[PDB]
Symmetry: C4
Subunit: 253 residues, 4 copies
């Protein structure tokens, strides 16, 4: 809020925090959005089967890999923006409390961990690589819809918990029912109850497991009941989430 009053720190903060403050602020916001989108495209295209061996980018002095070059450019821009915001913040105590800044730090972390490891062990490497996808959330800084979605999810945590709990109850119940209904066959597509968990989830969400359906009569009755109960139970805590989203979406206007 309050400018630093240095006549230069306040100007930089207002340029890098309020896109509507001036023309260069809008240009910088557009550039940041373009860089984020380019980083997303590079992250998606690194996994393409046509193109290191387990990290997606090979570090070299000459920077032979084009994907490494693009990732390095994006990380350099992100680090510049984050450092400049950190230096130009009026109150640096509350800088680390904002989620929109933790998203920014967590999007730069995987690059430096990989570089440090390579300069100086496979499951953790892939875990770090998966954290790279969390930089798509940096669009929340420039998208008000994404911020509204974040507020809705924060305000509807109990509702999400109830939805997951109800789905868990239904999944276990109908998995047990469909296992015990189709247990007396030699070609049972549900060998056990855990094997029927995903079928229960898919039937309840009405995604549909394709042609893999129960073969018995009791199995088909259980499948029909599962299809009904999924619609009946998912749609109970969803309307309150939609109401919260509408409240947070029309509050901006």
């Amino acid at each position: 809020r309050p400018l630093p009053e240095n006549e230069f720190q306040r100007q930089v903060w207002l340029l890098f925090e309020y896109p509507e403050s001036s023309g260069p602020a809008r240009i910088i916001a557009i550039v940041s959005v373009m860089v984020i989108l380019i980083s997303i495209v590079s992250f998606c295209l690194e996994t393409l089967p046509i193109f290191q061996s387990t990290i997606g980018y090979q570090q070299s002095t000459s920077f032979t890999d084009p994907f490494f070059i693009v990732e390095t450019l994006c990380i350099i821009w992100f680090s510049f923006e984050f450092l400049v915001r950190f230096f130009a913040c009026p109150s640096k105590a509350g800088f680390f409390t904002n989620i929109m800044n933790i998203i920014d730090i967590v999007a730069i972390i995987p690059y430096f961990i990989t570089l440090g490891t390579e300069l100086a062990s496979l499951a953790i490497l892939r875990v770090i690589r998966l954290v790279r996808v969390f930089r798509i959330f940096k669009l929340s800084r420039h998208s008000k819809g994404l911020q509204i979605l974040g507020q809705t999810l924060k305000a509807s945590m109990r509702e999400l918990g109830l939805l997951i709990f109800f789905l868990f109850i239904g999944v276990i119940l109908f998995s047990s029912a469909v296992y015990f209904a189709e247990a007396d066959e030699r070609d049972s597509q549900f060998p056990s109850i855990p094997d029927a968990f995903f079928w229960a989830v898919v039937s309840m969400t009405t995604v549909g497991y394709g042609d893999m359906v129960p073969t018995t009569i009791g199995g088909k009755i259980v499948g029909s009941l599962c299809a009904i109960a999924g619609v009946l139970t998912i749609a109970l805590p969803v309307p309150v989430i939609v109401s919260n989203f509408n409240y947070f979406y029309h509050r901006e206007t």
Copy 2:
């Protein structure tokens, strides 16, 4: 809210009925939830072939089966809780009227029936085994969302009946239509009308039968009509159920 008044039955009743009454009450509630979850996990993992022919656990003096040990421990805890609640209840006349106590009683019955059978014949044994899954509802004592769902279902029995009746009407109508539309084929995937019941249910719920679709033109028109009518008819009595759920869910605050 009536205390036992014995100065000793009251202490046990308040500990085992009001988790918020003290610290040990909450510890006991957490322990009970953990035991219920462990029993659920054991029930699900008994059917896994990787880790006694129709029940999933062999009762023996040596207790060789770990699953038998886990089930016995869970049943002992459930029986302890139920017996202590039954003894410490202020009014024992209304104890058996509460659904939350019938759920607790019906979750201990399958273990003792199996024990009596083993101490002293196949389909009924599997039926009793299927009843074991009803102990997942013992979480309703510790989950307010589950109690709210129970109240919603109690208050919306007419609406569930209408939903099932409408689904039955649509299923029979569209099964007849799709059987008679594709009757003049040698490779008809719908040999009869009962064979087309599950396809009708799956199309109406928009679960989707995968690649199995009518091959004729009239069959495809009937399938399109079924897909439309399922959405059109399932979504009529569901909003009132959602309204009942919202009423029972916001009535707490």
Copy 3:
């Protein structure tokens, strides 16, 4: 109120039209519902491949076919009920205006046409046979939910028309798009635009065509757009239909 004044026609009319009038009226209503359900079960079970070739029942003096016996008994009961109601109606002018009597008449018509054909070419016979399924609507006389659904459909004719028209627009648009996107393939699952009509209907209703999906990139973009647009367009006129149903359903009590 104004009684029929016959002193005998009124007694029969009140018995066969007002189930709440007395105990025998309730017994007759229960018997009629049971007979309707038995007729429905017989109609569904005639088509089973285990159990003449174009009518489902072979007419004989001895009545060898059990299905013919059941159909004859149900038709005799329906004709008795219809004739007694027609004779005992206070105003016979408005008897044929009620839809609940046209349903009753049209459920007896297929039986006598078949009897006349047997006693005294093929497509019309199967058309008449398909008309037999309309006797499931005779439950509307004894079910208030079915009458409420009928009133809702009468009051939402424009809304159903708009839903069908919007689906037609979307189906043609997306069928053209997915044919033109996947035209340049030798293994194209969409040889023409009419062949892509049902895929468009199924994608729009989110039923899902299984594993048959466009193989190109533009085809997959068109499929994603179809999946979005179906949800977005079916859900526009459905809420007004739901509102009409709620109005006709809460007005009952």
Copy 4:
């Protein structure tokens, strides 16, 4: 609403713009709707493989192709109507501002471009042929529901943008999750992240990819989360679109 006032231009404009003006206006409206439907049927049936090959019509002096004859008749009627409305318009300044006239012009363009090409080279041919499908929107002139849908879409552009943006976020996130969950397999159905985009779209819309499902446990957890999140995120900005549609639909009466 002001007539041309020429006593002949006004008469033509009122005949060709207000169907309720007289009987001939209604006859002309019915004829125009029939011609539009005939053109749509011809466009759909041109692609049928039973019947040059990359343009949809072969030009000859004798007009051998029946489809060319039908398309030429439809285009002649459309051009006559458009020219007569352009000549009979009261104010030609606002003629090009109405969307219902731009739709009319674009639906006639592909025929004249193609004719000029043949009388006096592959991808843009597909583009032009795809543009032919826009003549289905000429029904908006005669259908009030289509105009209401157009108003709803114009008034809900931000909501559509949010829906597409949320879809893109979810698709990228869940495609990355399901690629990295099923990366350590030799039979991985998701070779890369772009190859898993359409699976994510189909799962989120609950269309269902048939029997193609993740084989790992983490893959199935990601699939279940995708199925939940699709329902949870598509249904947030859709209710506001439905509200806009209801506002534009009940405003007539």
